[PDB]
Amino acid sequence: ATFEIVNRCSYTVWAAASKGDAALDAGGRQLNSGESWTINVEPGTKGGKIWARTDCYFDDSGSGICKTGDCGGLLRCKRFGRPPTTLAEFSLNQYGKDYIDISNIKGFNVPMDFSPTTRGCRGVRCAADIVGQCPAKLKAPGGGCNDACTVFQTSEYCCTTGKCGPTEYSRFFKRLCPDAFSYVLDKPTTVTCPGSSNYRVTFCPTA
């Protein structure tokens, strides 16, 4: 499956792609404003994620740091990134279908659209100014808007027991972005696509 990753932000981002225990394609790359990077993701990939990292520095060996979404200091991510990170999430070729969503469960850093480039399903988008409107207690000093689990580490926010409800904090994310997951047990906003669809992830789709 091909994913074209497009940076429409006015600032540079460092795209990342991982399934948690391995890189997808090269795992990461710098995208200047306007740049597009196309990666290939193996069919059957379960629990894949794509995200943006901001304010990164890497040396010539590809080691460094990012202010949001850092994946163990690597340019080429092999693991998931440090919150806050808006997440494009996907599982491919699962009994004949693909499943896609956007999630704010790990917070929000950069607005995103995640859409198929092939027929048979709709895209999803979370492009509101979540960082600008972020509740004081969730603001990440390093940049972005943290999820409540990251900030407070309670069973209720982290849904540790599989029993949790919406919260004042989850409702903030849901109000700004109805089409993204706002907490673990949120009413799903997952889209079912034909198996083996192709996709485009666009950062800052409306600006």
Coordinates of N, CA, C and O in Angstrom, one line a residue, residues 43-188:
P43 N 1.3 -4.9 2.9 CA 0.0 -5.4 3.2 C -0.1 -6.2 4.5 O 0.8 -6.8 4.9
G44 N -1.3 -6.1 5.1 CA -1.5 -6.8 6.4 C -1.0 -6.1 7.6 O -1.1 -6.6 8.7
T45 N -0.4 -4.9 7.4 CA 0.2 -4.2 8.6 C -1.0 -3.9 9.5 O -2.0 -3.3 9.2
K46 N -0.8 -4.3 10.8 CA -1.8 -4.1 11.8 C -1.3 -3.1 12.8 O -0.2 -3.2 13.3
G47 N -2.1 -2.1 13.2 CA -1.7 -1.1 14.2 C -0.6 -0.2 13.7 O 0.3 0.1 14.5
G48 N -0.6 0.2 12.5 CA 0.3 1.1 12.0 C -0.1 2.6 12.3 O -1.3 2.8 12.5
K49 N 0.9 3.4 12.5 CA 0.6 4.8 12.7 C 1.6 5.7 12.0 O 2.7 5.4 11.8
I50 N 1.0 6.9 11.5 CA 1.8 8.0 10.9 C 1.6 9.2 11.7 O 0.4 9.5 12.1
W51 N 2.6 10.0 12.0 CA 2.5 11.2 12.7 C 3.5 12.2 12.3 O 4.5 11.9 11.6
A52 N 3.3 13.5 12.7 CA 4.3 14.5 12.4 C 5.1 14.8 13.7 O 4.6 14.7 14.8
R53 N 6.4 15.1 13.6 CA 7.2 15.6 14.7 C 7.6 17.0 14.4 O 7.9 17.4 13.2
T54 N 7.7 17.9 15.4 CA 8.0 19.3 15.2 C 9.3 19.7 16.0 O 9.6 19.1 17.0
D55 N 10.0 20.7 15.4 CA 11.2 21.3 16.1 C 12.2 20.2 16.4 O 12.6 20.0 17.6
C56 N 12.7 19.6 15.4 CA 13.7 18.5 15.5 C 15.1 18.9 15.2 O 15.3 19.8 14.3
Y57 N 16.0 18.2 15.8 CA 17.4 18.4 15.4 C 18.0 17.0 15.3 O 17.9 16.2 16.3
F58 N 18.7 16.7 14.2 CA 19.4 15.4 14.0 C 20.8 15.7 13.6 O 21.0 16.6 12.8
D59 N 21.7 14.9 14.1 CA 23.1 14.9 13.6 C 23.2 14.1 12.3 O 22.2 13.6 11.8
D60 N 24.5 14.0 11.8 CA 24.7 13.3 10.6 C 24.4 11.8 10.6 O 24.3 11.1 9.6
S61 N 24.3 11.2 11.9 CA 24.0 9.8 12.0 C 22.5 9.6 12.2 O 22.1 8.4 12.3
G62 N 21.7 10.6 12.2 CA 20.3 10.5 12.3 C 19.8 10.3 13.7 O 18.8 9.8 14.0
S63 N 20.6 10.8 14.7 CA 20.2 10.8 16.1 C 20.0 12.3 16.6 O 20.8 13.2 16.2
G64 N 19.1 12.5 17.4 CA 18.8 13.8 17.9 C 17.6 13.9 18.8 O 17.4 13.0 19.7
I65 N 16.7 14.9 18.6 CA 15.6 15.1 19.5 C 14.5 15.9 18.8 O 14.8 16.8 17.9
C66 N 13.3 15.7 19.1 CA 12.1 16.5 18.6 C 11.3 16.9 19.8 O 11.2 16.3 20.8
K67 N 10.7 18.1 19.6 CA 9.9 18.6 20.7 C 8.5 18.0 20.9 O 8.0 17.9 22.0
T68 N 8.0 17.5 19.8 CA 6.8 16.6 19.8 C 7.0 15.4 19.0 O 7.7 15.5 17.9
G69 N 6.5 14.2 19.5 CA 6.5 13.0 18.7 C 7.9 12.3 18.6 O 8.0 11.4 17.8
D70 N 8.8 12.7 19.4 CA 10.2 12.0 19.4 C 10.0 10.5 19.6 O 9.3 10.0 20.5
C71 N 10.7 9.8 18.7 CA 10.7 8.3 18.8 C 12.1 7.8 19.2 O 12.9 7.4 18.3
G72 N 12.5 8.0 20.5 CA 13.8 7.5 21.0 C 15.0 8.2 20.3 O 16.0 7.6 20.2
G73 N 14.7 9.4 19.8 CA 15.8 10.3 19.3 C 16.3 9.9 17.9 O 17.4 10.3 17.5
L74 N 15.5 9.1 17.2 CA 15.9 8.7 15.8 C 15.2 9.5 14.8 O 14.0 9.8 14.9
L75 N 15.9 9.8 13.7 CA 15.2 10.3 12.5 C 14.3 9.3 11.9 O 13.2 9.6 11.6
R76 N 14.8 8.1 11.8 CA 14.1 7.0 11.2 C 13.4 6.2 12.3 O 14.1 5.3 12.9
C77 N 12.2 6.5 12.6 CA 11.5 5.9 13.7 C 11.3 4.4 13.6 O 10.9 3.9 12.5
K78 N 11.5 3.7 14.7 CA 11.2 2.2 14.8 C 10.1 2.0 15.8 O 9.5 0.9 15.9
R79 N 9.8 3.0 16.7 CA 8.9 2.9 17.8 C 7.9 4.0 17.7 O 8.1 5.0 16.9
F80 N 6.8 4.0 18.5 CA 5.9 5.1 18.5 C 6.4 6.4 19.2 O 7.4 6.3 20.0
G81 N 5.9 7.5 18.9 CA 6.4 8.8 19.3 C 5.9 9.3 20.7 O 4.8 8.9 21.1
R82 N 6.6 10.2 21.3 CA 6.3 10.8 22.6 C 5.1 11.8 22.4 O 5.2 12.7 21.5
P83 N 4.1 11.6 23.2 CA 3.0 12.6 23.1 C 3.5 14.0 23.4 O 4.5 14.2 24.1
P84 N 2.8 15.1 22.9 CA 1.5 15.0 22.2 C 1.7 14.7 20.7 O 2.6 15.3 20.1
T85 N 0.9 13.9 20.1 CA 1.0 13.5 18.7 C -0.4 13.2 18.1 O -1.0 12.3 18.6
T86 N -0.8 14.0 17.1 CA -2.0 13.6 16.4 C -1.7 12.4 15.6 O -0.6 12.3 15.0
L87 N -2.5 11.4 15.6 CA -2.2 10.1 15.0 C -3.1 9.7 13.9 O -4.3 9.6 14.0
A88 N -2.5 9.3 12.7 CA -3.2 8.6 11.6 C -3.0 7.2 11.9 O -1.8 6.7 11.9
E89 N -4.0 6.4 12.1 CA -3.9 5.0 12.5 C -4.6 4.1 11.5 O -5.6 4.4 11.0
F90 N -4.0 2.9 11.3 CA -4.5 2.1 10.2 C -4.1 0.6 10.5 O -3.1 0.3 11.0
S91 N -5.0 -0.3 10.0 CA -4.8 -1.7 9.9 C -5.2 -2.1 8.6 O -6.4 -1.9 8.2
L92 N -4.4 -2.8 7.8 CA -4.6 -3.1 6.4 C -4.8 -4.6 6.2 O -4.3 -5.4 6.9
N93 N -5.7 -4.9 5.3 CA -6.0 -6.3 4.9 C -6.4 -7.1 6.1 O -5.8 -8.2 6.4
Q94 N -7.4 -6.6 6.8 CA -7.9 -7.4 8.0 C -9.2 -8.0 7.5 O -10.2 -7.3 7.4
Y95 N -9.1 -9.3 7.2 CA -10.2 -10.1 6.7 C -10.9 -9.3 5.5 O -12.1 -9.2 5.4
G96 N -10.0 -8.9 4.6 CA -10.5 -8.3 3.3 C -10.7 -6.8 3.3 O -11.0 -6.3 2.2
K97 N -10.6 -6.2 4.4 CA -10.8 -4.7 4.5 C -9.7 -4.0 5.1 O -8.9 -4.6 5.9
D98 N -9.6 -2.7 4.9 CA -8.7 -1.8 5.6 C -9.5 -0.9 6.6 O -10.7 -0.6 6.3
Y99 N -8.9 -0.5 7.7 CA -9.5 0.3 8.7 C -8.6 1.5 9.0 O -7.5 1.3 9.4
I100 N -9.2 2.7 8.9 CA -8.4 3.9 9.2 C -9.2 4.8 10.2 O -10.4 4.8 10.3
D101 N -8.4 5.6 10.9 CA -8.9 6.6 11.8 C -7.9 7.6 12.2 O -6.7 7.5 11.9
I102 N -8.4 8.7 12.8 CA -7.5 9.7 13.4 C -7.8 9.7 14.9 O -8.9 9.5 15.3
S103 N -6.7 9.8 15.7 CA -6.9 9.7 17.1 C -6.2 10.9 17.8 O -5.1 11.2 17.5
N104 N -6.8 11.4 18.9 CA -6.3 12.4 19.8 C -6.1 11.8 21.2 O -5.9 12.5 22.2
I105 N -6.1 10.4 21.3 CA -5.9 9.8 22.5 C -4.5 10.0 23.1 O -4.3 10.0 24.4
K106 N -3.5 10.3 22.3 CA -2.2 10.6 22.6 C -1.9 12.1 22.4 O -0.8 12.5 22.2
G107 N -3.0 12.9 22.5 CA -2.9 14.4 22.3 C -2.9 14.8 20.9 O -3.1 14.1 20.0
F108 N -2.5 16.1 20.7 CA -2.6 16.7 19.4 C -1.4 17.6 19.2 O -1.0 18.4 20.1
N109 N -0.7 17.6 18.1 CA 0.4 18.5 17.8 C 0.2 19.3 16.5 O 0.4 20.5 16.5
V110 N -0.2 18.5 15.5 CA -0.3 19.1 14.1 C -1.6 18.7 13.5 O -2.0 17.5 13.7
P111 N -2.4 19.6 12.8 CA -3.6 19.2 12.2 C -3.4 18.2 11.0 O -2.3 18.3 10.4
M112 N -4.4 17.3 10.8 CA -4.1 16.3 9.8 C -5.4 15.9 9.0 O -6.5 15.9 9.6
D113 N -5.3 15.5 7.8 CA -6.3 14.9 7.0 C -5.8 13.5 6.6 O -4.6 13.4 6.2
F114 N -6.6 12.4 6.7 CA -6.1 11.1 6.4 C -7.2 10.5 5.4 O -8.3 10.2 5.9
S115 N -6.9 10.5 4.1 CA -7.9 10.1 3.1 C -7.4 9.0 2.2 O -6.2 9.0 1.9
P116 N -8.3 8.2 1.7 CA -8.0 7.3 0.6 C -7.7 8.0 -0.7 O -8.3 9.1 -0.9
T117 N -6.8 7.5 -1.5 CA -6.6 8.1 -2.8 C -7.2 7.1 -3.9 O -7.1 7.4 -5.1
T118 N -7.8 6.1 -3.4 CA -8.5 5.1 -4.2 C -10.0 5.1 -3.8 O -10.4 5.7 -2.9
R119 N -10.8 4.3 -4.6 CA -12.2 4.4 -4.5 C -12.8 3.6 -3.3 O -12.2 2.7 -2.8
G120 N -14.0 4.0 -2.8 CA -14.8 3.1 -2.0 C -15.0 3.5 -0.5 O -15.7 2.8 0.2
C121 N -14.4 4.6 -0.1 CA -14.6 5.1 1.3 C -14.2 6.6 1.4 O -13.7 7.2 0.5
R122 N -14.6 7.1 2.6 CA -14.4 8.6 2.8 C -13.1 8.7 3.6 O -12.5 7.8 4.2
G123 N -12.6 10.0 3.7 CA -11.5 10.3 4.6 C -11.9 10.8 5.9 O -13.1 11.0 6.2
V124 N -10.9 11.0 6.8 CA -11.2 11.6 8.1 C -10.3 12.8 8.3 O -9.2 12.9 7.7
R125 N -10.7 13.8 9.1 CA -9.9 15.0 9.3 C -10.0 15.5 10.7 O -11.1 15.5 11.3
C126 N -8.9 16.0 11.3 CA -8.9 16.8 12.5 C -8.0 18.0 12.3 O -6.8 17.9 12.4
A127 N -8.6 19.1 11.9 CA -7.8 20.2 11.4 C -8.1 21.5 12.2 O -7.7 22.6 11.8
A128 N -8.9 21.4 13.3 CA -9.2 22.6 14.1 C -7.9 23.0 14.9 O -7.0 22.3 15.0
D129 N -8.0 24.2 15.5 CA -6.8 24.8 16.2 C -6.8 24.3 17.6 O -7.0 25.1 18.5
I130 N -6.5 23.0 17.8 CA -6.5 22.4 19.1 C -5.4 23.0 20.0 O -5.6 23.2 21.2
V131 N -4.3 23.3 19.4 CA -3.2 23.8 20.2 C -3.6 25.2 20.7 O -3.4 25.5 21.9
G132 N -4.1 26.0 19.8 CA -4.5 27.4 20.3 C -5.5 27.4 21.3 O -5.5 28.3 22.2
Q133 N -6.5 26.5 21.3 CA -7.6 26.4 22.2 C -7.4 25.5 23.4 O -8.3 25.4 24.2
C134 N -6.3 24.9 23.5 CA -6.0 23.8 24.5 C -6.2 24.4 25.9 O -5.8 25.5 26.2
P135 N -6.9 23.6 26.7 CA -7.1 23.9 28.1 C -5.7 24.1 28.8 O -4.8 23.4 28.5
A136 N -5.7 25.1 29.7 CA -4.4 25.4 30.4 C -3.7 24.2 30.9 O -2.4 24.0 30.8
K137 N -4.4 23.3 31.6 CA -3.7 22.2 32.3 C -3.2 21.1 31.3 O -2.4 20.3 31.7
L138 N -3.6 21.2 30.0 CA -3.2 20.2 29.0 C -2.1 20.7 28.1 O -1.5 20.0 27.3
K139 N -1.8 22.0 28.2 CA -0.8 22.6 27.3 C 0.6 22.0 27.6 O 1.0 21.9 28.7
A140 N 1.2 21.6 26.5 CA 2.6 21.0 26.6 C 3.6 22.1 26.4 O 3.6 22.8 25.4
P141 N 4.4 22.4 27.4 CA 5.4 23.4 27.4 C 6.4 23.2 26.2 O 6.8 24.2 25.6
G142 N 6.6 22.0 25.8 CA 7.5 21.7 24.7 C 6.7 21.9 23.4 O 7.4 21.8 22.3
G143 N 5.4 22.1 23.4 CA 4.6 22.3 22.2 C 3.5 21.3 22.2 O 3.6 20.1 22.6
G144 N 2.3 21.7 21.6 CA 1.2 20.8 21.5 C 0.2 20.8 22.6 O 0.3 21.6 23.6
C145 N -0.8 19.9 22.6 CA -1.9 19.8 23.6 C -1.9 18.3 24.0 O -2.2 17.4 23.3
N146 N -1.5 18.1 25.3 CA -1.4 16.7 25.8 C -2.8 16.1 26.0 O -3.8 16.9 26.3
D147 N -2.9 14.8 25.9 CA -4.1 14.1 26.4 C -4.1 14.1 28.0 O -3.0 14.2 28.6
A148 N -5.3 13.8 28.6 CA -5.3 13.9 30.0 C -4.6 12.7 30.7 O -4.1 12.8 31.8
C149 N -4.5 11.5 30.0 CA -3.8 10.4 30.6 C -2.3 10.7 30.7 O -1.7 10.5 31.8
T150 N -1.7 11.3 29.7 CA -0.3 11.7 29.8 C -0.1 12.7 30.9 O 0.9 12.6 31.6
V151 N -1.0 13.6 31.2 CA -0.8 14.6 32.2 C -1.0 14.1 33.6 O -0.3 14.4 34.5
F152 N -2.1 13.3 33.8 CA -2.6 13.0 35.1 C -2.4 11.5 35.6 O -2.5 11.2 36.8
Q153 N -2.3 10.6 34.6 CA -2.0 9.2 34.9 C -3.0 8.5 35.9 O -2.6 7.9 36.9
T154 N -4.3 8.7 35.6 CA -5.3 8.0 36.4 C -6.0 6.9 35.6 O -6.0 6.9 34.4
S155 N -6.6 6.0 36.3 CA -7.3 4.9 35.7 C -8.4 5.4 34.8 O -8.7 4.9 33.7
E156 N -9.1 6.5 35.2 CA -10.2 7.1 34.4 C -9.7 7.6 33.1 O -10.4 7.4 32.1
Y157 N -8.6 8.3 33.1 CA -8.2 8.9 31.8 C -7.5 7.9 30.9 O -7.5 8.0 29.7
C158 N -6.8 6.9 31.5 CA -6.0 6.0 30.8 C -6.8 4.7 30.4 O -6.4 3.9 29.6
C159 N -8.0 4.6 31.0 CA -9.0 3.5 30.8 C -8.4 2.2 31.1 O -8.6 1.2 30.4
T160 N -7.6 2.2 32.1 CA -6.8 1.0 32.5 C -7.6 -0.2 32.8 O -7.1 -1.3 32.4
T161 N -8.8 -0.1 33.3 CA -9.6 -1.2 33.7 C -10.6 -1.6 32.6 O -11.3 -2.6 32.7
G162 N -10.6 -0.9 31.5 CA -11.5 -1.1 30.4 C -12.9 -0.5 30.7 O -13.8 -0.6 29.9
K163 N -13.0 0.2 31.8 CA -14.1 0.9 32.3 C -13.7 2.3 32.4 O -12.9 2.7 33.3
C164 N -14.2 3.2 31.5 CA -14.0 4.6 31.7 C -15.1 5.3 30.9 O -15.7 4.7 30.0
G165 N -15.3 6.6 31.2 CA -16.3 7.4 30.5 C -15.6 8.6 29.9 O -14.4 8.9 30.1
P166 N -16.4 9.4 29.2 CA -15.9 10.7 28.7 C -15.6 11.6 29.9 O -16.2 11.4 31.0
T167 N -14.8 12.6 29.7 CA -14.3 13.5 30.7 C -14.4 14.9 30.2 O -14.6 15.1 29.0
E168 N -14.2 15.9 31.1 CA -14.1 17.3 30.6 C -13.0 17.4 29.6 O -13.2 18.1 28.6
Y169 N -11.9 16.7 29.8 CA -10.8 16.8 28.8 C -11.1 16.1 27.5 O -10.8 16.7 26.4
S170 N -11.6 14.9 27.5 CA -11.9 14.2 26.3 C -13.0 15.0 25.5 O -12.9 15.1 24.3
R171 N -13.9 15.6 26.2 CA -15.0 16.4 25.5 C -14.4 17.6 24.8 O -15.0 18.1 23.8
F172 N -13.3 18.2 25.3 CA -12.6 19.3 24.6 C -12.1 18.8 23.2 O -12.4 19.4 22.2
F173 N -11.4 17.7 23.2 CA -10.9 17.2 21.9 C -12.1 16.8 21.0 O -12.0 17.0 19.8
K174 N -13.1 16.2 21.5 CA -14.3 15.8 20.7 C -15.0 17.0 20.2 O -15.6 16.9 19.0
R175 N -15.1 18.0 20.9 CA -15.8 19.3 20.5 C -15.1 19.9 19.3 O -15.7 20.2 18.3
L176 N -13.7 20.0 19.4 CA -12.9 20.6 18.3 C -12.8 19.6 17.1 O -12.8 20.1 16.0
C177 N -12.8 18.3 17.4 CA -12.6 17.3 16.3 C -13.5 16.1 16.5 O -13.1 15.1 17.0
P178 N -14.8 16.3 16.1 CA -15.7 15.2 16.3 C -15.3 13.9 15.6 O -15.8 12.8 16.0
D179 N -14.5 14.0 14.5 CA -14.2 12.8 13.7 C -12.9 12.0 14.1 O -12.5 11.2 13.4
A180 N -12.4 12.4 15.3 CA -11.2 11.7 15.8 C -11.6 11.1 17.2 O -12.4 11.6 17.9
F181 N -10.9 10.0 17.5 CA -11.0 9.4 18.9 C -10.6 10.4 19.9 O -9.5 10.9 19.9
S182 N -11.4 10.6 21.0 CA -11.0 11.5 22.0 C -10.6 10.8 23.4 O -10.0 11.4 24.2
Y183 N -11.0 9.6 23.5 CA -10.6 8.7 24.6 C -10.8 7.3 24.2 O -11.3 7.0 23.1
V184 N -10.2 6.4 25.0 CA -10.1 5.0 24.6 C -11.4 4.3 24.1 O -11.5 3.6 23.1
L185 N -12.5 4.6 24.9 CA -13.8 4.0 24.6 C -14.8 4.9 23.9 O -16.0 4.7 24.0
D186 N -14.2 5.9 23.2 CA -15.1 6.8 22.4 C -15.9 6.0 21.4 O -15.4 4.9 20.9
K187 N -17.0 6.4 21.1 CA -17.8 5.8 20.0 C -16.9 5.9 18.7 O -16.4 6.9 18.3
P188 N -16.6 4.7 18.1 CA -15.6 4.7 17.1 C -15.9 5.6 15.9 O -17.1 5.7 15.4

